[PDB]
């Protein structure tokens, strides 16, 4: 019960991380659903733990299309973030908003969502 509890501790670190991401997803969901679909930021999407205070701008998976339609998951009720229009079916559950359009974006844009409105 030495290394097993060690990887359990790693799973608990990932639990605190994914609950920080889920908490910021909830408050960020509130400030995004406060916006009338025009002052929305261009948001990086992912289906992986994306940890906005530890964002890595390395891979070409970074994308900057305007988010919308952040509705539930009605077996577990979630904020869900279609990255395009209604009819693109690109639902995700991990988002980080950034500055503007594509190509070597700026870095983080943390907690400036009230300055978008």
């Amino acid at each position: 019960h030495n290394d097993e509890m060690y990887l359990v501790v790693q799973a608990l670190i990932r639990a605190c991380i994914i609950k920080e991401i889920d908490l910021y997803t909830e408050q960020l969901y509130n400030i995004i659903k406060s916006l009338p679909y025009d002052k929305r930021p261009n948001v990086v999407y992912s289906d992986q733990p994306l940890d906005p205070n530890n964002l890595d701008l390395s891979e070409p998976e970074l994308w900057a299309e305007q988010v919308g339609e952040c509705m539930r998951y009605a077996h577990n009720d979630q904020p869900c973030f279609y990255i395009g229009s209604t009819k693109r079916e690109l639902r995700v559950n991990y988002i980080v908003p950034v500055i503007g359009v594509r190509d070597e974006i700026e870095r983080v844009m943390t907690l400036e969502e009230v300055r978008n409105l």
């Binding site: 659903k33 406060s34 916006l35 009338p36 679909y37 025009d38 919308g68 509705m71 539930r72 998951y73 009605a74 077996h75 009720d77 869900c80 209604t86 639902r91």
Partner: protein, 49 residues
């Protein structure tokens, strides 16, 4: 009227795992910028398909 009335039964495609809803008593945003309102709120469930 005319002949050839055809009753078509249709099966189910979306299973019960991937249903996504608009919940009750939650002010959601609105798509059209020409909307004079900005939010809307209902008292029941609005599903997806």
């Amino acid at each position: 009227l005319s002949g050839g009335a055809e009753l078509f039964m249709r099966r189910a495609s979306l299973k019960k795992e991937e249903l996504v809803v608009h919940p009750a008593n939650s002010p959601i945003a609105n798509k059209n910028p020409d909307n004079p309102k900005k939010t809307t709120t209902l008292s029941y469930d609005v599903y997806k398909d």
